[PDB]
Amino acid sequence: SLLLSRILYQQQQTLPSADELENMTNRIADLRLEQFEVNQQRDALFQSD
Amino acid sequence: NQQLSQRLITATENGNQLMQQNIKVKNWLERALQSERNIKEQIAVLKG
């Protein structure tokens, strides 16, 4: 189908750009470290008296 | 009889002290076990 080339071009034009993805895996590790630090602080402050 | 009573009192006091120390040790050991499991889980995912 020759016109199927036009359909494929339209479909490709419809595809969103995945290059805008933010590889925030480092931010995920930072969040995990912050959560561990908060847990440690809460454990240190568990005994209020 | 008096000597036996005194020995029993001293043994009971020592047993109470030992039970208190054992309870403190058990609490610390449970805390340590939890912390060690948590550290193992973290190091399983906290590489680099």
From Swiss-Prot, chain A:
It is found in: Cell inner membrane. Mechanosensitive channel that opens in response to membrane tension and specific ionic conditions. Requires high concentrations of external K(+), NH(4)(+), Rb(+) or Cs(+) to gate. May participate in the regulation of osmotic pressure changes within the cell, although it does not appear to have a major role in osmolarity regulation. Forms an ion channel of 1.0 nanosiemens conductance. The channel can remain active for between 30 seconds and over 3 minutes; it does not desensitize upon extended pressure. Its activity is masked in wild-type cells by the MscS channel. Belongs to the MscS (TC 1.A.23) family. This is Mechanosensitive channel MscK.
